Design a binder for this molecule. Structure first.
Ligand SMILES: O=c1cc[nH]c(=O)[nH]1
Ligand SMILES: O=c1cc[nH]c(=O)[nH]1
Lengths: 201, 201
């Protein structure tokens, strides 16, 4: 129920996200997340009883933000239209919450030492469910023949690139996703290549 | 053509790759690399005169392997044909050099503090050139109305994804790129999407 209690959790998690994304799992101290969140170690431990708990809690939060649109897919959506929106939402999150993207990525680079079993469990189940859905777009003629998972990965890869690889994107273009023009150019290009790449012909 | 020299340089670069990717730039000490490599610190310093130099060297290796195919591009090439093969080769290097790929990615996550000059200098310079080429194919009607820079980033993103997000790919797929049937499934699919997506119509 409680909004106060949620406000406090979100503050700890937000503070945690920022520290972890700078110092890493092993480099980060609970003492510092507490300082930045404006709460005591005791209070932090009361909500997240181990650094491992907290860290997993922030990573899960990113997944929920990311997977929302995909969880929202239903058997009778217009597929191409749904995918365009998913791409858009994913690029919005790369612009808005790039440190989220970065931490998730950091954890991957280390081998998902903490998040692995979460990927093999909840994530896989969710992807299996929506792969079937997509295969059914394919089976019914609404999409070109494409393997669902590689398509799902492609959306993830191509949208997260702009946060994760921002320094390189900036290096070559002079721009970041916070330039409204460049955001739009990016959305148009990622959408076109992907969507035209899966449009039925 | 000097036997023990060649061998030490390789021992140092490999030791450097492994150590940096565990502990990061600042977590690493030259002593560790030297130790791991079976050379003294002084010896190492003759091959590479600072920690910064060594680190740019390992990342410069994977940069040259990645870019090889792109430097190859010329005005008269069949554009689809060439993009097809580029995708194939990029995924090959994801299969074979995933640790190198991961380190490049980490440097990106860090803001590219140490690599920026390379990105803003030589790499930009190259991508500007090969952008012009690709820009050419589009102008002449040989490709769809695309922005070269973003097509290149999607190739990078989708192909490097299978190395950098390998645990997640395996998590949902049960496969890695070492599994031949998965490797081919990945290439066909990444190719199918990007290629169909940039085909002129
Ligand atoms: O959107 C998502 C969801 C899970 N993993 C990702 O890399 N991206
Ligand atoms: O393949 C490449 C080449 C340059 N930079 C990347 O990130 N990937």
């Amino acid at each position: 129920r409680s909004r106060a209690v949620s406000a406090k959790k979100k503050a700890i998690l937000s503070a945690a996200l920022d520290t972890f994304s700078q110092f890493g799992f092993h480099g980060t101290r609970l003492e510092q997340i507490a300082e930045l969140a404006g709460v005591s170690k005791t209070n932090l431990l009361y909500y997240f009883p181990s650094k491992e708990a907290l860290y997993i809690a922030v990573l899960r939060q990113i997944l929920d933000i990311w997977l929302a649109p995909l969880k929202a897919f239903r058997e009778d959506f217009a597929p191409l239209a749904a995918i365009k929106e998913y791409i858009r939402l994913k690029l919005e999150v790369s612009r808005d919450y790039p440190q989220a993207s970065r931490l998730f990525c950091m954890e991957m680079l280390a081998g998902a030492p903490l998040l692995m079993d979460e990927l093999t469990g909840d994530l896989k189940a969710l992807i299996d469910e929506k792969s079937a859905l997509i295969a059914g777009w394919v089976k019914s003629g609404k999409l070109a023949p494409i393997d669902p998972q590689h398509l799902i990965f492609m959306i993830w890869a191509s949208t997260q690139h702009y946060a994760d690889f921002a320094p390189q994107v900036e290096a070559v273009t002079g721009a970041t996703l916070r330039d409204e023009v460049f955001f739009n150019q990016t959305v148009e290009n990622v959408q076109r290549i992907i969507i035209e790449g899966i449009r039925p012909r």
